[PDB]
Every structure is written in C-alpha cells, then in structure tokens.
C-alpha cells in the first residue's frame, strides 16, 4: 500500500488507541474503513445533526452518517437487522442524533458491501456515546 494509505491507517490506529480500543480489536474497527480514501480526525461542535442505523430494539452505536439519504449498503451495513425479543429479521431503523458537546470524530469512507463473500459512503466514528443525543423519531 502507498504512502497515503499507510498514513490513513496510522491516523485511524492512533484515534482508536486514544479511545480505549486495544490493538488487536482496533484491527476490526479499521476493517470498517477504506484507507484508499482520506481518513481525518475532526472536532464537531454542539448542534450537529447526524444519523445512525440500528437494529430494532438495539442501543446506540458508534457509527454515524452525515445525511439521512445515505443507504445502508454504501455504509457497509446490511439493510436488515435483528429484532432480538421477536427473533426476527427486520429493517434497520434510522435514528437521528445531535451532538451535545464538542467531540472528536474519525471521518472516513466505508468499506461498502459487495458480493465477493455473498462507491462507499462517508461515515463518522465515535464511541463517546454521551456526546450524541438521541432525537425524537
């Protein structure tokens, strides 16, 4: 891989380490990013609207999209999730969040889902859940 790809990998590795993810697990988080596209750290101010797909009945996650128009496949996720109480496969729910505090995020392009084992969208990562407030749906 080229000097840009290696730099994007190092940006992500440093970010995940700083957010209490250990080095072996950090590889999996990095597997969600396409290092052929820019990876940068940004600080969001309070008041930024974001969106997040989740399985029905699931708590808040760590991955956000910048627009509600972005569909799951381009984000590297399946459009169907798991309703655990019902034992069913049902569509992912799109929830809205708004930053409540300044927060650093890792900005990248998803590795999107293709048919090999069967373009990517931009994404944000932050595991500082309390900095993103759930909005009414």
């Amino acid at each position: 891989h080229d000097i840009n790809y290696r730099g994007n990998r190092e940006t992500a590795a440093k970010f995940f380490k700083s957010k209490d993810i250990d080095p072996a697990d950090a590889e999996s988080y990095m597997n969600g990013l396409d290092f052929n596209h820019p990876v940068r750290v940004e600080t969001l101010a309070p008041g930024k609207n974001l969106w997040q797909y989740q399985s029905p009945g699931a708590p808040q996650g760590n991955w956000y999209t910048l627009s509600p128009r972005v569909q799951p496949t381009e984000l590297g996720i399946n459009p169907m999730g798991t309703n655990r109480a019902a034992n069913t496969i049902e569509p992912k729910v799109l929830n809205s969040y708004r930053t409540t505090q300044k927060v650093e995020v890792l900005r990248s392009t998803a590795a999107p889902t293709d048919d090999f084992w069967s373009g990517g969208a931009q994404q944000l990562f932050s595991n500082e859940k309390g900095s993103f407030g759930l909005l009414p749906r």
Partner: protein
Amino acid sequence: MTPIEYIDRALALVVDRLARYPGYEVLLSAEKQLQYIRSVLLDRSLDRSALHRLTLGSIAVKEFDETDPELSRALKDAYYVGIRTGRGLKVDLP
C-alpha cells in the same frame, strides 16, 4: 485457544445465530469467511490472497457490537487470526 479453536468458536456462534435468524445474509457471509480462514490455517498451500478481502471485523463492529457482544468478540478475534495469518505474524491471542 489455538487459532483453529478461535475460528471454530466463531463458527459455533454463527451457526447458533443462524438457527435464531435463518438465512440472514450477514451471518451467511460471516460463515463463508470463517470457513475460508479455517481452510488456510489448516493448509498452507492454499491461496491466501482473499485474506485481505475479509470484512469480518467490519461485520463485528458495525452489525453486532451492541446487539450481540458475544458474537462480536468471537468475530473480532477470528478476524485478527485471519489478518495475522495473512501478514505472516504469530497469532498472539491467549
């Protein structure tokens, strides 16, 4: 666990979850990827190019980090087995 035990642990959990959610594409993909890793662990003569096309780590964190932490853990560890194998490094898991 040995590296094969980490892969068979992940396969056991994926099969259990497929009984809960039959046909679920995320789990069918994870199964195929785990079987691929298993094959290259057991036979060093097989082509290893597809190790760098694994998505198991992404599946663990984007699909299961909240809904199924037990599965997410097993898939993170299996993905790590895969990429350390692909990179020619010791699988330094306990």
